[PDB]
Coordinates of all heavy atoms in Angstrom, one line a residue:
Chain A
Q1 N 93.0 165.7 170.1 CA 92.2 166.6 169.3 C 90.8 166.8 169.7 O 90.2 168.0 169.5 CB 92.3 165.9 167.7 CG 93.2 164.6 168.0 CD 93.4 164.6 169.4
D2 N 90.2 165.8 170.2 CA 88.9 165.8 170.7 C 88.8 166.6 172.1 O 89.9 166.6 172.7 CB 88.3 164.5 170.9 CG 87.3 164.3 172.0 OD1 86.1 164.9 171.8 OD2 87.6 163.7 172.9
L3 N 87.8 167.2 172.4 CA 87.4 167.9 173.7 C 87.8 167.0 174.9 O 88.5 167.6 175.7 CB 86.0 168.5 173.6 CG 85.5 169.1 175.0 CD1 86.5 170.2 175.2 CD2 84.2 169.5 174.8
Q4 N 87.3 165.8 174.9 CA 87.5 165.0 175.9 C 89.0 164.4 176.0 O 89.6 164.3 177.0 CB 86.6 163.8 176.0 CG 85.2 164.3 175.5 CD 84.4 163.1 174.9 OE1 83.7 162.4 175.5 NE2 84.6 163.0 173.6
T5 N 89.4 164.1 174.7 CA 90.7 163.5 174.5 C 91.8 164.5 174.9 O 92.7 164.2 175.7 CB 90.9 163.2 173.1 OG1 89.8 162.1 172.6 CG2 92.2 162.6 172.7
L6 N 91.7 165.7 174.3 CA 92.8 166.7 174.6 C 92.7 167.3 176.0 O 93.6 168.0 176.5 CB 92.7 167.9 173.7 CG 93.9 168.8 173.5 CD1 94.9 168.0 172.8 CD2 93.6 170.1 172.8
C7 N 91.6 166.9 176.8 CA 91.4 167.3 178.2 C 92.5 166.6 179.1 O 92.8 167.1 180.2 CB 90.0 166.9 178.7 SG 89.1 168.2 179.8
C8 N 93.0 165.5 178.5 CA 94.0 164.7 179.3 C 95.4 165.3 178.8 O 96.5 164.6 179.0 CB 94.0 163.3 178.9 SG 94.7 162.1 180.1
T9 N 95.4 166.4 178.1 CA 96.7 167.0 177.7 C 96.7 168.5 177.9 O 97.3 169.0 178.8 CB 96.9 166.7 176.1 OG1 96.5 165.4 175.9 CG2 98.4 166.9 175.7
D10 N 95.8 169.1 177.2 CA 95.6 170.7 177.2 C 94.8 171.0 178.6 O 95.4 171.6 179.4 CB 95.0 171.1 176.1 CG 94.5 172.6 176.2 OD1 95.2 173.4 176.9 OD2 93.4 172.9 175.7
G11 N 93.5 170.4 178.5 CA 92.8 170.7 179.7 C 91.5 171.5 179.2 O 91.5 172.3 178.3
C12 N 90.4 171.3 180.0 CA 89.3 171.9 179.8 C 88.9 173.0 181.0 O 89.0 172.5 182.1 CB 88.0 171.0 179.5 SG 88.5 169.6 178.5
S13 N 88.2 174.1 180.7 CA 88.0 175.0 181.7 C 86.4 174.7 182.1 O 85.8 174.1 181.4 CB 88.0 176.5 181.2 OG 89.2 176.5 180.2
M14 N 86.0 175.2 183.2 CA 84.7 175.1 183.8 C 83.7 175.6 182.8 O 82.6 175.0 182.5 CB 84.5 175.8 185.0 CG 83.2 175.4 185.8 SD 83.0 176.2 187.3 CE 84.3 175.4 188.3
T15 N 83.9 176.7 182.2 CA 83.2 177.4 181.1 C 82.9 176.5 179.9 O 81.8 176.4 179.5 CB 83.8 178.7 180.7 OG1 85.2 178.7 180.8 CG2 83.2 179.9 181.6
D16 N 84.0 175.8 179.5 CA 84.0 174.9 178.2 C 83.1 173.8 178.6 O 82.4 173.3 177.7 CB 85.4 174.3 178.1 CG 86.6 175.4 178.3 OD1 86.3 176.6 178.3 OD2 87.7 175.0 178.2
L17 N 83.0 173.4 179.9 CA 82.1 172.3 180.2 C 80.7 172.7 180.2 O 79.7 172.0 179.8 CB 82.4 171.6 181.7 CG 84.1 171.7 182.0 CD1 84.2 171.3 183.3 CD2 84.7 170.8 181.0
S18 N 80.5 174.1 180.6 CA 79.2 174.5 180.6 C 78.6 174.7 179.3 O 77.4 174.5 179.0 CB 79.2 175.8 181.4 OG 79.9 175.9 182.5
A19 N 79.5 174.9 178.3 CA 79.1 175.0 176.9 C 78.6 173.5 176.4 O 77.9 173.5 175.4 CB 80.2 175.4 176.0
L20 N 79.1 172.6 177.0 CA 78.7 171.2 176.7 C 77.5 170.8 177.4 O 76.8 169.9 177.1 CB 79.9 170.2 177.1 CG 80.0 168.9 176.2 CD1 80.5 169.3 174.8 CD2 80.9 167.9 177.0
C21 N 77.1 171.6 178.5 CA 75.9 171.3 179.2 C 74.7 171.9 178.6 O 74.1 173.0 179.1 CB 76.1 172.0 180.6 SG 77.2 170.9 181.7
Chain B
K1 N 96.6 179.8 178.2 CA 95.7 178.7 178.2 C 95.9 177.6 179.4 O 96.6 176.8 179.2 CB 95.6 178.0 176.9 CG 94.9 176.7 176.7 CD 93.4 177.0 177.1 CE 92.4 175.9 176.9 NZ 92.9 174.7 177.8
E2 N 95.2 177.9 180.5 CA 95.3 177.0 181.6 C 94.0 176.6 182.0 O 93.1 177.3 182.3 CB 96.0 177.8 182.8 CG 96.3 177.0 184.1 CD 97.1 175.6 183.7 OE1 97.5 175.5 182.5 OE2 97.3 174.9 184.6
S3 N 93.7 175.2 182.1 CA 92.6 174.6 182.5 C 92.7 173.4 183.2 O 93.9 173.0 183.4 CB 91.6 174.3 181.1 OG 91.9 175.4 180.3
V4 N 91.7 172.7 183.6 CA 91.8 171.5 184.5 C 92.0 170.3 183.5 O 91.4 170.3 182.4 CB 90.7 171.2 185.3 CG1 91.1 170.5 186.5 CG2 89.8 172.5 185.5
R5 N 92.8 169.3 183.9 CA 93.0 168.2 183.0 C 92.3 167.0 183.5 O 92.6 166.3 184.5 CB 94.6 167.8 182.9 CG 95.4 168.8 182.1 CD 95.9 170.0 182.9 NE 96.3 171.1 182.0 CZ 96.7 172.3 182.4 NH1 96.9 172.4 183.7 NH2 97.1 173.3 181.4
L6 N 91.2 166.6 182.8 CA 90.3 165.5 183.1 C 90.4 164.4 182.1 O 90.4 164.7 180.8 CB 88.9 165.8 183.4 CG 88.4 166.9 184.5 CD1 89.3 166.5 185.6 CD2 88.9 168.3 184.2
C7 N 90.7 163.2 182.4 CA 90.8 162.1 181.5 C 89.6 161.2 181.4 O 89.4 160.4 182.6 CB 92.2 161.4 181.7 SG 93.6 162.5 181.9
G8 N 88.8 161.1 180.5 CA 87.7 160.2 180.3 C 86.7 160.3 181.5 O 86.0 161.2 181.5
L9 N 86.8 159.3 182.4 CA 85.7 159.2 183.5 C 85.9 160.5 184.3 O 84.8 160.9 184.7 CB 86.1 158.0 184.4 CG 86.1 156.6 183.8 CD1 86.6 155.6 184.7 CD2 84.6 156.4 183.3
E10 N 87.1 161.1 184.5 CA 87.3 162.3 185.3 C 86.6 163.4 184.5 O 85.9 164.3 185.3 CB 88.7 162.5 185.5 CG 89.6 161.5 185.9 CD 89.0 160.6 187.0 OE1 88.7 161.2 188.1 OE2 88.5 159.5 186.8
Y11 N 86.7 163.3 183.3 CA 86.1 164.5 182.5 C 84.4 164.3 182.5 O 83.7 165.3 183.0 CB 86.5 164.5 181.1 CG 86.0 165.6 180.2 CD1 86.3 166.8 180.2 CD2 84.9 165.2 179.1 CE1 85.7 167.8 179.5 CE2 84.3 166.2 178.4 CZ 84.8 167.6 178.6 OH 84.2 168.5 177.8
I12 N 84.0 163.2 182.2 CA 82.6 162.9 182.2 C 81.9 163.1 183.5 O 80.9 163.8 183.5 CB 82.4 161.4 181.8 CG1 82.9 161.1 180.4 CG2 80.9 161.0 181.9 CD1 83.1 159.6 180.1
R13 N 82.7 162.8 184.5 CA 82.0 162.9 185.9 C 82.0 164.4 186.3 O 80.9 164.9 186.8 CB 83.0 162.4 187.0 CG 82.3 161.9 188.3 CD 83.4 161.2 189.2 NE 84.1 160.2 188.7 CZ 85.5 160.2 188.3 NH1 86.2 161.1 188.8 NH2 86.1 159.2 187.8
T14 N 83.0 165.2 185.9 CA 82.9 166.7 186.1 C 81.8 167.3 185.2 O 81.0 168.2 185.7 CB 84.2 167.4 185.8 OG1 85.4 166.6 186.5 CG2 84.3 168.7 186.2
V15 N 81.7 166.8 184.0 CA 80.7 167.5 183.1 C 79.3 167.1 183.5 O 78.5 168.1 183.7 CB 80.8 166.9 181.7 CG1 79.7 167.4 180.7 CG2 82.2 167.5 181.1
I16 N 78.9 165.9 183.7 CA 77.6 165.5 184.2 C 77.2 166.1 185.6 O 76.1 166.5 185.8 CB 77.5 164.0 184.4 CG1 78.5 163.5 185.4 CG2 77.7 163.3 183.0 CD1 78.3 161.9 185.7
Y17 N 78.3 166.4 186.4 CA 78.0 167.0 187.6 C 77.5 168.4 187.5 O 76.6 168.9 188.0 CB 79.3 167.1 188.4 CG 79.1 167.5 190.0 CD1 78.7 166.7 190.9 CD2 79.5 168.8 190.2 CE1 78.5 167.1 192.2 CE2 79.4 169.3 191.6 CZ 78.9 168.5 192.5 OH 78.6 168.9 193.9
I18 N 78.1 169.2 186.5 CA 77.9 170.6 186.3 C 76.6 170.6 185.6 O 75.6 171.4 185.9 CB 78.9 171.4 185.3 CG1 80.3 171.3 186.2 CG2 78.6 172.8 185.2 CD1 81.4 171.9 185.5
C19 N 76.3 169.8 184.6 CA 75.0 169.8 183.7 C 74.0 169.4 184.6 O 72.9 170.1 184.5 CB 75.3 168.6 182.7 SG 76.5 169.0 181.4
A20 N 74.2 168.4 185.7 CA 73.0 168.2 186.5 C 72.7 169.3 187.5 O 71.5 169.7 187.7 CB 73.3 166.9 187.3
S21 N 73.8 169.9 188.0 CA 73.6 171.0 188.9 C 72.8 172.2 188.2 O 72.0 172.9 188.9 CB 74.9 171.5 189.4 OG 75.6 170.6 190.0
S22 N 73.1 172.4 187.0 CA 72.6 173.5 186.2 C 71.0 173.1 185.9 O 70.1 173.9 185.6 CB 73.2 173.7 184.9 OG 74.6 173.8 185.2
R23 N 70.7 171.8 186.1 CA 69.3 171.4 185.9 C 68.5 171.4 187.0 O 67.1 171.4 187.1 CB 69.3 170.1 185.1 CG 69.0 168.8 186.0 CD 67.8 168.1 185.8 NE 66.6 168.9 185.9 CZ 65.4 168.7 185.7 NH1 65.0 167.5 185.1 NH2 64.3 169.5 186.0
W24 N 69.2 171.4 188.2 CA 68.5 171.3 189.4 C 68.3 172.9 189.9 O 67.1 173.2 190.4 CB 69.3 170.6 190.5 CG 69.5 169.2 190.2 CD1 70.8 168.6 190.2 CD2 68.7 168.3 189.8 NE1 70.6 167.2 190.0 CE2 69.3 166.9 189.5 CE3 67.1 168.2 189.5 CZ2 68.6 165.9 189.2 CZ3 66.5 167.0 189.3 CH2 67.2 165.9 189.1

């Protein structure tokens, strides 16, 4: 459910990471 | 919905990399 957690399932895009930056 | 799959360290490493590059 978490952004980092679901990244090991769904996945995070580059843009999504930039939003965390 | 297609994105990269990073788990923990892999995610953190990719995030800090982009965050740092954007600060440089």
Side-chain angles (χ1 to χ4, degrees), chain A residues 2-21, chain B:
Chain A
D2 152 69
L3 172 61
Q4 324 150 92
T5 301
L6 201 68
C7 218
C8 202
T9 320
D10 165 38
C12 318
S13 336
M14 195 177 290
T15 30
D16 321 348
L17 323 176
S18 316
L20 208 72
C21 280
Chain B
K1 173 59 174 57
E2 182 59 3
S3 316
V4 215
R5 284 88 198 181
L6 292 323
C7 312
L9 299 174
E10 311 317 293
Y11 181 72
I12 299 163
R13 207 178 309 118
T14 310
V15 174
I16 60 177
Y17 188 79
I18 299 176
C19 293
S21 305
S22 310
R23 98 115 292 175
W24 298 131

